[PDB]
UniProtKB/Swiss-Prot annotation, chain A:
GO CC terms, sorted: plasma membrane-derived thylakoid membrane; plasma membrane-derived thylakoid photosystem II
Predominant localisation class: membrane
Name of encoding gene: psbC
GO biological process: photosynthetic electron transport in photosystem II
Summary of subunit composition and partner proteins: PSII is composed of 1 copy each of membrane proteins PsbA, PsbB, PsbC, PsbD, PsbE, PsbF, PsbH, PsbI, PsbJ, PsbK, PsbL, PsbM, PsbT, PsbX, PsbY, PsbZ, Psb30/Ycf12, peripheral proteins PsbO, CyanoQ (PsbQ), PsbU, PsbV and a large number of cofactors. It forms dimeric complexes.
Domain of life of the native organism: Bacteria
Gene3D superfamilies from the UniProt entry: photosystem ii from thermosynechococcus elongatus
Keywords of the record: Chlorophyll, Chromophore, Manganese, Membrane, Metal-binding, Photosynthesis, Photosystem II, Thylakoid, Transmembrane, Transmembrane helix
Note on cofactor: Binds multiple chlorophylls and provides some of the ligands for the Ca-4Mn-5O cluster of the oxygen-evolving complex. It may also provide a ligand for a Cl- that is required for oxygen evolution. PSII binds additional chlorophylls, carotenoids and specific lipids.
Name of protein: Photosystem II CP43 reaction center protein
Source organism of this protein record: Synechocystis sp. (strain ATCC 27184 / PCC 6803 / Kazusa)
SUPFAM superfamilies for the chain: Photosystem II antenna protein-like (SSF161077)
Family that this chain belongs to: Belongs to the PsbB/PsbC family. PsbC subfamily.
Annotated positions binding [CaMn4O5] cluster: E331, R334
Curated annotation (Swiss-Prot), chain C:
Organism listed in the record: Synechocystis sp. (strain ATCC 27184 / PCC 6803 / Kazusa)
Annotated membrane topology: Single-pass membrane protein
Transmembrane feature ranges: 8-32
GO cellular component terms, semicolon-separated: photosystem II reaction center; plasma membrane-derived thylakoid membrane; plasma membrane-derived thylakoid photosystem II
Keyword annotations of the record: Electron transport, Heme, Iron, Membrane, Metal-binding, Photosynthesis, Photosystem II, Thylakoid, Transmembrane, Transmembrane helix, Transport
Role description: This b-type cytochrome is tightly associated with the reaction center of photosystem II (PSII). PSII is a light-driven water:plastoquinone oxidoreductase that uses light energy to abstract electrons from H(2)O, generating O(2) and a proton gradient subsequently used for ATP formation. It consists of a core antenna complex that captures photons, and an electron transfer chain that converts photonic excitation into a charge separation.
Protein name: Cytochrome b559 subunit beta
UniProtKB/Swiss-Prot annotation, chain F:
Swiss-Prot/TrEMBL catalytic activity: 2 a plastoquinone + 4 hnu + 2 H2O = 2 a plastoquinol + O2
Organism from which the protein derives: Synechocystis sp. (strain ATCC 27184 / PCC 6803 / Kazusa)
Cofactor remark from the record: The D1/D2 heterodimer binds P680, chlorophylls that are the primary electron donor of PSII, and subsequent electron acceptors. It shares a non-heme iron and each subunit binds pheophytin, quinone, additional chlorophylls, carotenoids and lipids. D1 provides most of the ligands for the Mn4-Ca-O5 cluster of the oxygen-evolving complex (OEC). There is also a Cl(-1) ion associated with D1 and D2, which is required for oxygen evolution. The PSII complex binds additional chlorophylls, carotenoids and specific lipids.
UniProt entry tagged with the keyword Calcium: yes
Protein name per Swiss-Prot or TrEMBL: Photosystem II protein D1 2
InterPro entries cross-referenced by the UniProt entry: D1/D2, Photo_II_D1/D2_sf, Photo_RC_L/M, Photo_RC_L/M_CS, PSII_D1
Localization, UniProt: Cellular thylakoid membrane
PANTHER family: PHOTOSYSTEM II D2 PROTEIN (PTHR33149:SF12), PHOTOSYSTEM II PROTEIN D1 (PTHR33149)
Gene: psbA2
Chain sites annotated for binding pheophytin a: Y116, Y137
Swiss-Prot record, chain G:
Major site of localization recorded for this protein: membrane
Localization of this protein: Cellular thylakoid membrane
GO biological process assignments: photosynthesis
Biological source species: Synechocystis sp. (strain ATCC 27184 / PCC 6803 / Kazusa)
Disruption phenotype: No visible growth phenotype, decreased rate of O(2) evolution during growth at 30 degrees Celsius, 50 umol photons/m(2)/s; as light increases above 1000 umol photons/m(2)/s O(2) evolution decreases dramatically. Decreased amounts of peripheral proteins PsbO, CyanoQ (PsbQ), PsbU and PsbV in purified PSII.
Gene: psbY
One Pfam family, short name: PsbY
Molecular function GO labels: manganese ion binding
Subunit structure: PSII is composed of 1 copy each of membrane proteins PsbA, PsbB, PsbC, PsbD, PsbE, PsbF, PsbH, PsbI, PsbJ, PsbK, PsbL, PsbM, PsbT, PsbX, PsbY, PsbZ, Psb30/Ycf12, peripheral proteins PsbO, CyanoQ (PsbQ), PsbU, PsbV and a large number of cofactors. It forms dimeric complexes.
Record HAMAP family: PSII_PsbY (MF_00717)
Domain of life: Bacteria
Keywords from the named record: Membrane, Photosynthesis, Photosystem II, Thylakoid, Transmembrane, Transmembrane helix
Protein name: Photosystem II reaction center protein Y
InterPro entries: PSII_PsbY
One term under GO cellular component: plasma membrane-derived thylakoid photosystem II
């Protein structure tokens, strides 16, 4: 393989393009990189464990990995209190050590192994233009992805459960026993609108629906894996797509961009798969928490919170949603679709119930609302909490804010990468990625426009 | 051979850094400006002129350091080191903000020296001097903003301070006190600057995507030679592309590049005219028809009236700390504020 | 071959670099000043 | 293609350049360090140390108000 | 000026007895304030109820008055309403309830003394301490 | 030979005066829809209760606005992120009161500009061009999506979208500074470097080319007649331009390669606008700019202000005055 | 002022060290420019 411009036509700043047709070095690149991902997982987990104060809420402490492990049900109890520090440490150590194994294997294949795998084995050696082998690799990796989704199902059903924030008695690690196998609910989540009140798949509000979706995903991915091992692409697919390594890269780039946007919105809105005991309140959660906190405070002073008009004529504490539901007032009218385990006990069939607001508010709901309104996902880049006009004394930016911003930006730049690699794949397959040929310039043969 | 021609020979020698006759103005003055900035932001306080820390020595960072403007009590005094305020005392000169007219005047003369350098090198090389004519835009902005605007005001205090957040303060100041967004001269500047950025992006992308295949590498950068006579990209294909995408296209490369000059330079000159207007408080602050209608009818609201309320609030809340020499005592009850904030 | 050491370019490089390193050492000392 | 000076890559890869600059650049660095850490920069530029923004007899901002006699004003401000 | 002895000299009780925190105790109280109190008591306000702030007039107006160290230490052990009538031990962070306030469960008696001392020293360093939410 | 193949050949035809293409089949209807509704709403739409507090803001020309103050006002805060098409309103007058035209115009416009980007790729493919002009156009698209879609999603209301008007744009900018300190956000700082530098490099490039034009005319006629459209030769001396600019600063600061220079021209403002679009898109989730309020304290602990503190006072003024009847509670949390 | 001497003496050390390491060739260049 050429490791310079004169022998490849690619500069140093585009060097990894020198690997496109070197499958062994490409595999080593791919495997060393996986090393890196598992390395960050393990080392970041060990960092977060070392900096963790377990009696303090995770979201106060700049943690984005321990909430993921805690949502799986490890090292936590009721209300997300940390029982034991050892499962988080175990997850870190196992990733870190394995990452050493993956890094050694990538270096081998990259530096010492055969540069092309096609002269060594037909099973592992691939040509990008060989549609059967490409779909075989899709198929192997789909069976593995389905096995991973079924492993999440097995953790929730058979090996200790997941954290359910919606659990009666308070949020707790519970074992899922009746997952939603009903395909109407599971795929009607896919059919729901990506707008307010509907939320597409971001609105999944119970662990039974989540675990049932992963049974179906596991089944769908395993079936699609066998499909693609046993079959070859059909004529419409062969005539519709570009068949090259850069093309398949760009297809994956568009896919990754879509999932990055979905992940940013998921962590910004959903409090079920991202429980607020670990990630802190959502922005909608915190705004409704402030409205509830001052409803409770002024009700304790003797305000008639239902008959109180504000300055505009709308109700100061309670008002009507556009479909009529009894909701909190002020600007949080926007957030009347919010649902949370601290709030839903005060909701009736028509919305917020006057009787429950008068004589069913518990002290823990007040405590949770005060904590969530003061841990709103508002913060500066140097991690100064609250509104931006506040002074420097509160060191806090929400993990929801960090995760959402990161993945939105990642998703955008991966769309840019999709456009770049798709466009280049199209031009390279069509033969003009290196520029216009002067003799056969296509515009010089076209008629004039006017 | 006379001494003038021998000196002209030495100053115009081909060397890593061209000096020229203009360098005698350019290189000390710029070194006085930039070093004067770098000294001030490292060491010099604004505690006696502004009541602010503005140096790395006081704990400020790169965003918050500045060579801040002088105290308002000096008016438009040039604040020479030997002048009647500092009287030769270097420490007092630093404390009263003499570094601001030091950097602003050495910068002015340095910018003059740079334009003279553009003219001199254009004459010696043998090209037309359109780089200097293009550089008049930045000189118009510097002269209007840093010199003419405080000269129309009470003092050098209200000039922009040579710092990041100090410039941001000046920006927000001209919003809340002058409604400078509402000024059409500024709006023409915004059009020119965003249009120049558009022209830069669109021209670079169009050239890089209509390149002729003049080489074998996927690296297309080495298929160009500076001594070649032919165009490296297709003007015809680019023109057809933009004619079918956008409706119109450039057909003349010379007009393309003159337009690329013309748009941001005209934007800078128009915004400079607006800044000269703001020097005398000749603002585009209000639409009097909408003010009279809103005064007589309290249901009428537009975005313009909302922005007027925003400016009112910023003025009242910012003025006591921003103009500490005025001793504005505004009690809490007189500050305009909406409900619950 | 047999290049001059001291040039106009030399003075240009040092006029900026020498107080640059002086100031960078000063700001580095500033990082350890306590309130 | 070259104006006549020694190329920078030939200079910064030479032993003599590093023999000289292995002392000259640390000496300039620690000279700036000693400019700050001895407190000389405070008296040179008139910048207050963290304990002289306010005195026992002045709790307000020392904003200059005299047109000319600023030496007496600053002394009074202390 | 420096952080003098008199700046760190604050009333200890209602009988005129005073106390003087050290610099170490002041910094420990400021650290406890940043780590635990500032989420609601940033700059001496109270984001959840600004009728009852950490300003000196509001601390003086409590029943009994809370502008001394002993009353502040008693409040953080048993928080009450502003008139001292309603039990607020399940509504305000306190050292007597670790089961609902685990963040305060490792704070010692001297930690509460220091944060009470910092609460008394911080209003005379800031004119905007304990004001309105936007100020 | 089939009717569908004839339609495919017409749609993808390089002989069309305006290229349609398959992306154009989406772009043309959407952009025409958003343009028609925008013009009609800008001239004649009734006032819109943008803040959901029954305080309708007049945006159209016929209701007392001028060109500067006119806007298509964003949809009601009561709507939030809810989908509000015409058919979900009980009447057209209700749809107009609640800011439905904003949702119609924005949604069609955003589809239209994404299909404009795809159409730019498509014509580059049909012309045998390199395909990355659409990558450059992705930067204004990212900024438009940031202010019309992403910031409303993060804040939970289209009411927080940039209004379709001049003074409404200024209102959006000012409230954004009040709530996010975008000036102190390093990505806006890259945006500003992007547009300032893009205008600088536009002027330098244009000035250097115009400075170095080959003599082909008289001084009576315009110099632009020295260029013939479709001529093979270069119209300026790149070596003279390089010999000027490498003496203006120094030799290796100057591009001798036209392709390298044109890449830099394309890349710098595109990257800057990408960064500031991500700044607005991340401030959507309230990851705000730098807060240095009371960062500097004297040895006693008294605040020593900086320019950031004065900027914060300006931000307070805006904030406590904006949407002055909307807030019922002490914190602006969204 | 001990502070001024303490600050200035690294500069004198740097100028001195560069002078011993460059002075023969600097004298040679000065003789070459007369
Ligand atoms: C090719 C594709 C072409 C497809 C085009 C179709 C349009 C796609 C974009 C959708 C437009 C979104 C507008 C309103 C979004 C919204 O209301 O919100 C976003 C919704 C989420 O909806 C929210 O979902 C929430 C669900 O939470 C509910 O349920 C939860 C369960 O835990 C909680 O309990 C929570 O409290 C409770 O309220 C609520 O329903 C909210 O009211 C609801 O608004 O996201 C979603 O549905 C899906 C994610 C939306 C898009 C993701 C971002 C895409 C950005 C691309 C930018 C590219 C730029 C590149 C430039 C070049
Ligand atoms: C072009 C591109 C080329 C680039 C060039 C770059 C070169 C830069 C070098 C130029 C620097 C000039 C600085 C001028 C200082 C100044 O002006 O200083 C101002 C002084 C006047 O002083 C001011 O005078 C005011 C009025 O005073 C009068 O009134 C007062 C109250 O009634 C008192 O009675 C007082 O005693 C009485 O004198 C106030 O006192 C102010 O505090 C005081 O500063 O004028 C003067 O020195 C001279 C006045 C006449 C000359 C004006 C030329 C400059 C143009 C200014 C435009 C002004 C306004 C238009 C703005 C737009
Ligand atoms: C995820 C990051 C990543 C990975 C995995 C690779 C991987 C690869 N690159 Mg790319 N590359 C990258 C980033 C990456 N690159 C970046 C950012 C650039 C821009 C600077 C380049 C520029 C580039 C060029 C220009 C070229 C490559 C080439 C290659 C391939 C051969 C490498 C070689 O010959 O190295 C030889 C290098 C060494 C022997 C030096 C030592 C390297 C080892 C791996 C150090 C590992 C240290 C580690 C701590 C040890 C752990 C050991 C154990 C405990 C696990 C290899 C598959 C070459 C290629 O295409 O081959 C045909 C090639 O020409 N790369
Ligand atoms: C998904 C990615 C992700 C996310 C959301 C977080 C989030 C967080 N991390 Mg983690 N971290 C990450 C990746 C991530 N990190 C990686 C990859 C590393 C290894 C380098 C670390 C190492 C790390 C440490 C060591 C620490 C954190 C900490 C933190 C917290 C504070 C962050 C902070 O102050 O940032 C400050 C913000 C910035 C530095 C801004 C960076 C801006 C980037 C460079 C913009 C890039 C844009 C784009 C991609 C560039 C493309 C250019 C081209 C396309 C044109 C926060 C919860 C801290 C904490 O509290 O932990 C307890 C902490 O101590 N992280
Ligand atoms: C995606 C990863 C990947 C892939 C596709 C390959 C593919 C290949 N490797 Mg490489 N390798 C990898 C990772 C990978 N390797 C890693 C991580 C290491 C470091 C441990 C190595 C170290 C390595 C060496 C040292 C050699 C190869 C060789 C080979 C070739 C022969 C394979 C063989 O004999 O299989 C048949 C073997 C088996 C079927 C038994 C192994 C079954 C696996 C290991 C057990 C289960 C996998 C795993 C534990 C499950 C969890 C993984 C986790 C990430 C989810 C083949 C091209 C050989 C070569 O270059 O040939 C010329 C060779 O000498 N590999
Ligand atoms: C990530 C894994 C993966 C990958 C890379 C592929 C890749 C491929 N599949 Mg496979 N597939 C997978 C998983 C995967 N599949 C799974 C899990 C299953 C089981 C359900 C199948 C079942 C399957 C079948 C049955 C067939 C393929 C076929 C194909 C080929 C053509 C696909 C195509 O043109 O789509 C492009 C998509 C279209 C042309 C449909 C247009 C519809 C619009 C555009 C959808 C827009 C939705 C919007 C963008 C996002 C909304 C999200 C959600 C609400 C829907 C291609 C090789 C085909 C083939 O050649 O068979 C061998 C084929 O017939 N796949
Ligand atoms: C998994 C995703 C993926 C993969 C496998 C590739 C693979 C490839 N890309 Mg693509 N690309 C991607 C995503 C991806 N890209 C994305 C998301 C974008 C949009 C930004 C691009 C944009 C892009 C362009 C514009 C080009 C490629 C090119 C290439 C080829 C050579 C790359 C190389 O050598 O880089 C070398 C690596 C470097 C020079 C270093 C990159 C430096 C970045 C900016 C660092 C970003 C900062 C980072 C966040 C961390 C911050 C650190 C900070 C603290 C200092 C190779 C086939 C080239 C090509 O077309 O070849 C055919 C090419 O010109 N890529
Ligand atoms: C190819 C290539 C590349 C890449 C490379 C890579 C990507 C890699 C890797 C690698 C890896 C991926 C690695 C690794 C590692 C790991 C390790 C080495 C580990 C470990 C461990 C340990 C030792 C641990 C320990 C511990 C424990 C056990 C617990 C406690 C804590 C502690 C930490 C102590 C580059 C770019 C350079 C370019 C060239 C070529
Ligand atoms: C797990 C879970 C779940 C579930 C889920 C599911 C069940 C799913 C799914 C999914 C799916 C089922 C998907 C998908 C997708 C698709 C796509 C994304 C596509 C596409 C497209 C394309 C790509 C195409 C393209 C094209 C065209 C357009 C035409 C021409 C040709 C081409 C190819 C170019 C739930 C939610 C329940 C809960 C939570 C958890
Ligand atoms: C004022 C005054 C004056 C003047 C002076 C001068 C002229 C001087 C100077 C000076 C100077 C001239 C200084 C300097 C400096 C510097 C600095 C301070 C630096 C820096 C830097 C840095 C820190 C950078 C960094 C970085 C970045 C950021 C990017 C990349 C990487 C690097 C590392 C490069 C006199 C005495 C005459 C008189 C009196 C007044
Ligand atoms: C590289 C950084 C460059 C920035 C400048 C660095 C230099 C360091 C500052 C030294 C300051 C010396 O401190 C101050 O100096 C001035 C000299 O102008 C002295 O000034 C004294 O002599 C001058 C000279 O006639 C009199 O006009 C003046 O009235 C008198 O006070 C002050 O008595 C002294 O307090
Ligand atoms: O609307 Mn539109 O501006 Ca977002 O922040 Mn809350 O909301 Mn309302 O206030 Mn501030
Ligand atoms: Ca806390
Ligand atoms: Cl407003
Ligand atoms: Cl509100
Ligand atoms: Fe050009």
């Amino acid at each position: 393989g050429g490791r310079d411009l004169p022998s490849t036509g690619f500069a140093w700043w585009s060097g990894n393009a020198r690997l496109i047709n070197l499958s062994g070095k490409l595999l080593g690149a791919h495997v060393a990189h996986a090393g890196l991902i598992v390395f960050w997982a393990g080392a970041m987990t060990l960092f977060e464990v070392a900096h963790f104060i377990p009696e303090k809420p995770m979201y106060e402490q700049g943690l984005i990995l321990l909430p993921h492990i805690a949502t799986l049900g490890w090292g936590v109890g009721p209300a997300g209190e940390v029982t034991d520090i050892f499962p988080f440490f175990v997850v870190g150590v196992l990733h870190l050590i394995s990452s050493a194994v993956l890094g050694l294997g990538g270096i081998y294949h990259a530096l010492r192994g055969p540069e092309v795998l096609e002269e060594y084995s037909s099973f592992f050696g691939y040509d990008w233009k060989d549609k059967n082998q490409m779909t075989n690799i899709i198929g192997y990796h789909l069976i593995l992805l389905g096995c991973g989704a079924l492993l999440l199902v097995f953790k929730a059903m058979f090996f200790g459960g997941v954290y359910d924030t919606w659990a009666p008695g308070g949020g707790d690690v519970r074992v899922i026993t009746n997952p939603t196998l009903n395909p109407a609910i599971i795929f009607g989540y896919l059919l729901k609108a990506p707008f307010g009140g509907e939320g597409w798949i971001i609105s999944v509000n119970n662990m039974e629906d989540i675990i049932g979706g992963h049974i179906w995903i596991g089944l769908i991915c395993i079936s699609g894996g066998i499909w693609h091992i046993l079959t070859k692409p059909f004529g419409w697919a062969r005539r519709a797509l570009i068949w090259s390594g850069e093309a398949y890269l760009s297809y994956s780039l568009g896919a990754l961009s879509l999932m990055g946007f979905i992940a940013s919105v998921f962590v910004w809105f959903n409090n079920t798969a991202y429980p607020s005991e670990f990630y802190g309140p959502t922005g909608m959660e915190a705004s409704q928490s402030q409205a509830f906190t001052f409803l409770v405070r002024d009700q304790r002073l003797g305000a008639n919170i239902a008959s109180a008009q504000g300055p505009t004529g709308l109700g100061k504490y309670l008002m009507r949603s556009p479909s009529g539901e009894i909701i909190f007032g002020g600007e949080t009218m926007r957030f009347w679709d919010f649902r949370g385990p601290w709030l839903e006990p005060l909701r009736g069939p028509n919305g917020l119930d006057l009787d429950k607001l008068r004589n069913d508010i518990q002290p823990w709901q007040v405590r949770r609302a005060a904590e969530y309104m003061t841990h709103a996902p508002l913060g500066s880049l140097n991690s100064v909490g609250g509104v931006i006009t506040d002074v420097n004394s509160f060191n806090y930016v929400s993990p929801r804010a960090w995760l959402a911003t990161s993945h939105f930006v990642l998703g955008f730049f991966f769309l840019v990468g999709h456009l770049w690699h798709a466009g280049r794949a199209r031009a390279a397959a069509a033969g003009f990625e290196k520029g216009i040929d002067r003799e056969t310039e296509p515009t010089l043969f076209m008629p004039d426009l006017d | 051979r006379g001494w003038f021609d021998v000196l002209d020979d030495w100053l115009k020698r081909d060397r890593f850094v061209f000096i020229g006759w203009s360098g005698l103005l350019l290189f000390p003055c710029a070194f006085m400006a930039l070093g004067g900035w770098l000294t001030g932001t490292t060491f010099v306080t604004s505690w006696y002129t502004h009541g602010l820390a503005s140096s790395y020595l006081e704990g400020a960072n790169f965003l918050t350091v500045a060579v801040s403007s002088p105290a308002d009590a000096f008016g438009h005094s040039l604040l020479f080191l030997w002048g009647p305020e500092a009287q030769g005392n270097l420490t007092r000169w630093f404390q009263i903000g003499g570094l601001w007219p030091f950097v602003a005047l050495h910068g002015a003369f340095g910018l003059i020296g740079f334009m003279l350098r553009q003219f001199e090198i254009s004459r010696l090389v043998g090209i037309r001097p359109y780089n200097a004519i293009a550089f008049s835009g930045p000189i118009a902005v510097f002269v209007s903003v840093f010199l003419m605007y405080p000269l129309g005001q009470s003092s050098w205090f209200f000039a922009p301070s040579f710092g990041v957040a100090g410039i941001f303060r000046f920006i927000l100041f001209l919003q809340g006190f002058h409604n400078w967004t509402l000024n059409p001269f500024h709006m023409m500047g915004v059009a020119g600057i965003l249009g120049g950025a558009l022209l830069c992006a669109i021209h670079g992308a169009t050239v890089e995507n209509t390149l002729f295949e003049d080489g074998e590498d996927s690296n297309t950068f080495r298929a160009f030679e500076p001594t070649q006579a032919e165009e490296t990209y297709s003007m015809v294909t680019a023109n057809r592309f933009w004619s079918q995408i956008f409706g119109i296209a450039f057909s003349n490369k010379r007009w393309l590049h003159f337009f690329m000059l013309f748009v941001p330079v005209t934007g800078l000159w128009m915004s400079s005219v607006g800044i000269v207007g703001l020097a005398l408080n000749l603002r585009a602050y209000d639409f009097v028809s909408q003010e009279l209608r809103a005064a007589e009818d309290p249901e009428f609201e537009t975005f313009y009236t909302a922005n007027i309320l925003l400016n009112e609030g910023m003025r009242a809340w910012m003025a006591p700390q921003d103009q500490p020499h005025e001793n504005f005592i505004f009690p809490e009850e007189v500050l305009p504020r909406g409900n619950a904030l | 071959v047999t290049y001059p050491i001291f040039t106009v370019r030399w003075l240009a490089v040092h006029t900026l670099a020498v107080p640059s390193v002086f100031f960078v050492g000063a700001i580095a000392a500033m990082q350890f000043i306590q309130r | 293609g070259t104006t006549g000076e020694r190329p920078f890559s030939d200079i910064v890869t030479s032993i003599r350049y590093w023999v000289i600059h292995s002392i000259t650049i640390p000496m300039l660095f620690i000279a700036g360090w000693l400019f700050v850490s001895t407190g000389l920069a405070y008296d040179a530029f008139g910048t207050p140390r963290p304990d002289e923004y306010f005195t026992q007899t002045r709790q307000e901002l020392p904003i200059l108000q005299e047109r000319y006699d600023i030496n007496q004003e600053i002394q009074e401000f202390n | 000026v420096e952080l003098t002895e008199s700046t760190r000299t604050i009333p200890l009780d209602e009988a005129g007895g005073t106390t003087t925190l050290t610099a170490r105790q002041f910094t420990n109280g400021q650290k406890i304030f940043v780590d635990t109190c500032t989420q609601c008591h940033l700059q001496g306000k109270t984001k959840t109820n600004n009728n009852v702030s950490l300003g000196l007039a509001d601390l003086a107006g409590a029943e009994p008055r809370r502008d001394n160290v002993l009353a502040l230490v008693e409040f953080l052990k048993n928080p009450k309403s502003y008139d001292g009538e309603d039990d607020y031990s399940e509504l305000h962070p306190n050292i007597s309830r670790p089961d609902i306030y685990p963040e305060m469960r490792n704070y010692t008696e001297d930690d509460i003394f220091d944060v009470a001392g910092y609460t008394l020293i911080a209003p005379k360093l800031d004119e905007r301490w304990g004001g309105t939410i936007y100020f | 030979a089939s009717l569908w193949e004839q339609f495919c050949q017409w749609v993808t035809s390089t002989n069309n005066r305006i290229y349609v293409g398959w992306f154009g089949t989406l772009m043309i209807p959407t952009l025409l829809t958003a343009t028609t509704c925008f013009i009609i709403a800008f001239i004649a739409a009734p006032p819109v209760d943008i803040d959901g507090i029954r305080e309708p803001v007049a945006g159209s020309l016929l209701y007392g606005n001028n060109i500067i103050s006119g806007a298509v006002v964003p949809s009601s805060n009561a709507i939030g992120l809810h989908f509000y098409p015409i058919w979900e309103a009980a009447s057209l007058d209700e749809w107009l009161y609640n800011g439905g035209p904003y949702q119609l115009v924005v949604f069609h416009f955003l589809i239209g500009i994404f299909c404009y980007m795809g159409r730019q790729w498509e014509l580059s493919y049909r012309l045998g061009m390199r395909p990355w002009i659409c990558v450059a156009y992705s930067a204004p698209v990212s900024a438009a999506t940031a202010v019309f879609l992403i910031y409303p999603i993060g804040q939970g209301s289209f009411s927080d979208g940039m209004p379709l008007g001049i003074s409404g744009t200024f209102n959006f900018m000012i409230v954004f500074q009040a709530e996010h300190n975008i000036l102190m956000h390093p990505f806006h700082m890259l945006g500003v470097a992007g547009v300032f530098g893009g205008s600088l490099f536009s002027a330098m490039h244009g000035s250097l080319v115009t400075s170095s034009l080959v003599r082909e005319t008289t001084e009576v006629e315009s110099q632009n007649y020295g260029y013939k459209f479709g001529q093979e030769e270069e119209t300026y001396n790149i070596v003279a331009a390089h010999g000027y600019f490498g003496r203006l600063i120094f030799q290796y600061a100057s591009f001798n390669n036209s392709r390298s220079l044109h890449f830099f021209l394309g890349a710098w403002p595109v990257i800057g606008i990408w960064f500031t679009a991500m700044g607005v898109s991340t401030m959507a989730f309230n990851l705000n700019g730098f807060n240095f309020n009371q960062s500097i304290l004297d040895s006693q602990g008294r605040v020593i202000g900086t320019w950031a503190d004065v900027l914060n006072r300006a931000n307070i003024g805006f904030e406590v005055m904006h949407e002055r009847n909307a807030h019922n509670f002490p914190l602006d949390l969204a | 002022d001990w502070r001024v001497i303490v600050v200035v003496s690294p500069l004198l050390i740097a100028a001195t060290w560069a002078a011993i390491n460059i002075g023969a060739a600097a004298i040679r260049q000065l003789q070459d420019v007369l």
